[PDB]
Each structure stands twice: as C-alpha cells, then as structure tokens.
Amino acid sequence: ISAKDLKEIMYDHLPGFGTAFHQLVQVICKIGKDNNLLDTIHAEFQASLADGDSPQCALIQITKRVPIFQDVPPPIIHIRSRGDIPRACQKSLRPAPPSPKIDRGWVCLFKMQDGKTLGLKI
Amino acid sequence: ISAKDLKEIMYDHLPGFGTAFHQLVQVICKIGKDNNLLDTIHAEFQASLADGDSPQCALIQITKRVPIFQDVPPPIIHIRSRGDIPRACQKSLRPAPPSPKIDRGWVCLFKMQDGKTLGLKI
Amino acid sequence: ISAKDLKEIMYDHLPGFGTAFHQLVQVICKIGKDNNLLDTIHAEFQASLADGDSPQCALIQITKRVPIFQDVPPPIIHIRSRGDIPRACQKSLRPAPPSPKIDRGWVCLFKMQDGKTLGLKI
Amino acid sequence: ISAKDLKEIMYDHLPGFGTAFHQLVQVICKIGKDNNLLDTIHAEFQASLADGDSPQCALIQITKRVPIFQDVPPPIIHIRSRGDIPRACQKSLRPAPPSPKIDRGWVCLFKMQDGKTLGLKI
RNA sequence: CUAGACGUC
RNA sequence: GACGUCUAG
RNA sequence: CUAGACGUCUAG
RNA sequence: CUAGACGUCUAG
C-alpha cells in the first residue's frame, strides 16, 4: 500500500476538511511511509473501525499502539503565516511544551519563518 | 575477558541508551564469545580509543579490522513486535539489501512474527 | 553553535567516561537544542571557565542560571535493566521524589520496563 | 540439522577411531554450531562427496571453502597428560606456530595443565 | 557516530 | 537550516 | 635409470 | 587422508 492511498482511505472516513485529524492523517502516513509501516497502520485502522471505533479514535489508537509514534517527535512543518493553517485547526493551536509527544495529542509543530512556533494539539 | 565485562566496558563509553551501537555491542560480544575472540576484540577497541576514535568509531573498527565479521552474516533476531526494538534503534531500521554485511554497517536483522524483516543499519 | 559541537567542547573538559556529568552534558545539550539556548549555554560555560570555575561547577551553574532548566523536568529515559546505566553513574542512582528538579541535581529519570524508577542525582 | 546428526553423518564416512579427522569433525561441528553454519557446511560436505572426494578430503574442503575457518583459531582442549589424546592422533602432534590456522591443517591445540601445549596437524 | 562526493525546499 | 542517495572509517 | 622408504615444503 | 615439488637413504 502507498502513503497516498492510505491518506485517501483515512480521509473518506473523516468529517469536514482541514481538521486536526486530517493533519494527523498526513503526519501518520508521512512517518509511516518513512519507516515502512504503512501496512501495519492500515491493518490497525481497519481493525479499529471493525471493532466499532470511530475513525478519530482509530487514528489516536495508531498514535498509541504503533511503536514508531512513541519515538518520533511531532514533525516540524515550516510555514509562512498563521493563516496558512486551516481554520478547523486554528482554535487547536498552542505554545509547545519542552517535549511534545505524538501519543499525547501533538500532531505537529508549526514553525513560522518569523520565529514563532505553535503546536497542533488534539 | 568475559562477554559481560566487555559489554559493560563498551557500554560505559557510549552515549544514549538502546542505540544502534548498543545493539552492535551485543552482536560483537555474542560473536566474539562464540569463537573465543573476545581478547582480540578488546585489544582492537582500546587500540582505536588510543587512535582518538570515538567509541562508536571503535566498534566499527572492530567490524572492519577483525576478520570474522567479514564471514558471518548479520544475525537474525526473532521478535514478537517491533516495539521490542529500543526507541533509539527505531529510526535506523530499514529493508535489508540482498547480502547485508556487518562490516558495511548492518548490525542485525529483525524478523517479526508478522513476516516483516528490517535490518539495523548504522 | 551546534549541539554536537557543544557536547564535544563540554566533554573535552570532563574526566573519565560515563559519569553523571557526562549524562548531564547530554541532558543540557538536548534541552538547550530543543529551544535554541545552545548559544546561551555556550556563553555561560565559557564565562564560567574564564572566571576559573571547574567545568563541573560550570555545568551545575548552568542548571541553576539558565531559566529553561527551571521550567523543564528531568527527562525520562526508558531502559531495560539497571545494568544498562554506566558504571560511574551507578552509585549516584536513587528513588525519585514527587517533583524532582533539574536545578536540584536531578539529571534524568530512568524508567525501567519493570515499572520501577531510578533518578540520577548529582 | 543439529550438530550431533551432522557429526554422525561425518563419522559414518570415517575409518578407525579417535583419528585426527574425528577430532576435526568435532571442531567443524562446534564452530558451525556456534555461528549457525551447519546447513552450509553440510551442503559443502555433500558437494565434495558429489565430486568424488574422500570424506577426509571433503572435510578438508570444508576448511578450505567456507571462509570462517580462516578466521577462528584452532580450539584449545585442556588435558591432563599426552596419553589422554587418542592413539590414532598421536602421530599427528607437533609444536604449534604463533598463529596456527585451521585451513592449514591445524585441527586443535592440546593444552596440558602443566602449561605445555601440542598442536594436532593433518 | 563521523568524514567525503552528489541530489532536493 | 531540513531532508535524500552513494562511498569510506 | 627404475622401484620401495623417510624427512622438508606446497596444494586439495 | 590424497596429490605435487625438493632433498636423502636403501636395493637392483
């Protein structure tokens, strides 16, 4: 399975667009492709859904049960302005703690070119 | 001159915990113990230290300068989940080439019960 | 200044290997890198040395004088056994209090897979 | 294939008792066992048989063709008297060079507890 | 771990 | 500054 | 020269 | 164990 196919598959289950969970889909598929775990993640998403878990719940479970998400920091994405971040994410931005953890809700860190940093927290 | 004393000596010089180099210590000491070459391995480790080599570089020198590490394949270590691999090792896992060699940086091969196989590469 | 460069600078002034101060160097450089205080830490280290303080004293003064080490808790490090902690650090290990502070000598917290927790205290 | 079964497969081709070659069978099976090379060693034993080589010759072909036997030293076997060595081996004992190698005919080293040492050379 | 060469915003 | 590949210790 | 041997060395 | 190379000795 490809990262794009899993992204699309996870998306078709998500309500709205550009929410924190879409960003999390992006992060999960990115890191998962980077260490050849797309397969396992796919399996876990499917399991979780089949178990009656909501897709957001499933994604969170991936963050907690897939080992790579315990060891990687939330990815840093460089952006231009705070307005580049989708509106559904706006009210979910907050100053980053010393060690933000993916399995504790930290999807990514938005590092702006003027120095500012805002974390995306679920 | 025991595998444990050598393990402890090497660990005492290394930064971090559960890193690729700790695992490499494990492999080096296993093979050395298995063929009574511990003394040699030790001699080479301190010779390298005497050359100004980093402890990491020294372990690598062991693999390059002691001939047996040219002849044995990276060991296969069977594990249940990928989460049995230490956190520091996670970002060093990658698909194995056809004939991976220890003296080229391939510490070991992790065989997962789900079929997956990933090599540990420095 | 990069964390690795600062790490080597600080190491070059430290006696022995795998002491509590080596691990403390690792902690200081890790956190300092996590928020660009590398410059500040470097300046502080160098000023202290020029004033005639031992490098050990300089490191401790860092934990006391640089504000980040009063806002962050001692990092938690996952390891398998107590025998993974370097020998020079062994007699410096002890049960952790409720709120260990970096500026009070608490370098890191070792979390073992047996549940047990040991702090490294200077 | 276990070390004992292969030991026997190798024995069943050998004449006499307590010969240098029975001892060599032991050395080969030990080393192959220690580095999990029993399968390949076996494979070479029959390849040699398929060439029409004498079984003794076949074993020597193992020493020549599987690389590890260039790199592990002849094993030290501790004994009490020279009369502890099987008689068929007596006529093959002689002083050991600084670095005796298995692929050059040095099966093992007989070490007396008084310190004196005799090599077994085919 | 580190060095060299090359590629990418 | 962040990545990638190859090579070497 | 031929044939039996013993040593040394090389090779499988 | 086997084959080469080189010496040596013994015999015819």
Curated annotation (Swiss-Prot), chains A, B, C, D:
One of its GO terms (biological process) is symbiont-mediated suppression of host toll-like receptor signaling pathway. The keyword Phosphoprotein applies. The keyword Ribonucleoprotein does not apply. It comes from the Viruses. Its main location: virion. The modification Phosphoserine is found at S99. One of its GO terms (molecular function) is RNA binding. Disulfide bonds: none annotated. Residues 1-122 form the VP35 IID domain. There is a cross-link at K91 (Glycyl lysine isopeptide (Lys-Gly) (interchain with G-Cter in ubiquitin)). GO terms for cellular component: host cell cytoplasm; virion component. Homodimer. Homooligomer; via the coiled coil domain. Interacts with nucleoprotein NP and polymerase L; VP35 bridges L and NP and allows the formation of the polymerase complex. Also interacts with VP30; this interaction is regulated by VP30 phosphorylation. Interacts with host IKBKE and TBK1; the interactions lead to inhibition of cellular antiviral response by blocking necessary interactions of IKBKE and TBK1 with their substrate IRF3. The interferon inhibitory domain (IID) binds dsRNA. Plays an essential role in viral RNA synthesis and also a role in suppressing innate immune signaling. Acts as a polymerase cofactor in the RNA polymerase transcription and replication complexes. Serves as nucleoprotein/NP monomer chaperone prior to the formation of the large oligomeric RNA-bound complexes. Regulates RNA synthesis by modulating NP-RNA interactions and interacting with DYNLL1. VP35-NP interaction controls the switch between RNA-bound NP and free NP and thus the switch between genome replication and genome packaging into the nucleocapsid. This is Polymerase cofactor VP35. It comes from Reston ebolavirus (strain Reston-89). The chain holds residues 208 to 329 of 329 of the full protein.
